Amino acid sequence: RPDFCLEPPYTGPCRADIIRYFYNAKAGLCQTFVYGGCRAKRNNFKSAEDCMRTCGGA
């Protein structure tokens, strides 16, 4: 439920396609996004379980 769970997801500048999760506070759900591989922001998790642990929920 930390504040950064409400940040929009951030692919960043790098040009890989790494599968990561973000909490989508509009859907109330952790969802996948394309992470470019560097310069991650905090709403960026390696699994749905990690995202749900931190962000729920809310």
Binding site: P13, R15, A16
Partner: protein, 224 residues
């Protein structure tokens, strides 16, 4: 690749796809047993897919070879993106043939204005998620270092150079990283980063392979 075209099938026999579950990065075959890619493409396990055109359909020219060693440049910095280059050693040599073969390392870096060929299975849209099945190609010029720096003030290190167009619409994009920029028959760049993809005034940024020729040759020798 945004604003490009579909490459002729197997006409870039040095282009590889890095796969872990799905395609996530490109690479370039530089010897029978070694591939160059980007350090930010690192994973502890990678399957290298050679001889591909359509990455979703078996076409009969593919070779799938797991990586045996994956070696990032020791000075890679994940925050500045300096030294964004990596080597992958294949667990068995690739079979070199008309559809799978190597690209030469460069003997000089490419002059501004040189036209190069950039390729990969990256996103084909500047806004959206249109990941192609078939390998895409882009012809694009090297920018001056001054214009590269002007485009990304403070961000362009000595490992980096820009290739592309300031007017927007033509660039590499996510899932192209690690793949080739070939100029005058030589591997000159590794797809690295940019702000957005094909945005106006924000060209692609690539790792300058010439700066790593000795590192590549010495690393290959030390690991065979």
């Amino acid at each position: 690749i945004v604003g490009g075209y579909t490459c002729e099938e197997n006409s870039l026999p040095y282009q590889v796809s890095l796969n872990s579950g799905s395609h996530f990065c490109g690479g370039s075959l530089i010897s029978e047993q070694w591939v160059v890619s980007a350090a930010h493409c690192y994973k502890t396990r990678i399957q290298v897919r050679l001889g591909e055109h359509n990455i979703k359909v078996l076409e009969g020219n593919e070779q799938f070879i797991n990586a045996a060693k994956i070696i990032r440049h020791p000075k890679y910095n994940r925050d500045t993106l300096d030294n964004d280059i990596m080597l992958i050693k294949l667990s068995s040599p690739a079979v070199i043939n008309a559809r799978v073969s190597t690209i030469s390392l460069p003997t000089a870096p490419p002059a501004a204005g040189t036209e190069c060929l950039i390729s990969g299975w990256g996103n084909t849209l500047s806004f959206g998620a249109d990941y192609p099945d078939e390998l895409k190609c882009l012809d694009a010029p090297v920018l001056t270092q001054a214009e590269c720096k002007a485009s990304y003030p403070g961000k362009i290190t000595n490992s980096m150079f820009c290739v592309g167009f300031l007017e927007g619409g033509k660039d590499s994009c996510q899932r192209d990283a690690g793949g080739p920029v070939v100029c005058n028959g030589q591997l000159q760049g590794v797809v690295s980063w940019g702000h957005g993809c094909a945005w106006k005034n924000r060209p692609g940024v690539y790792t300058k392979v010439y700066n790593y020729v000795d590192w590549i040759k010495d690393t290959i020798a030390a690991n065979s």
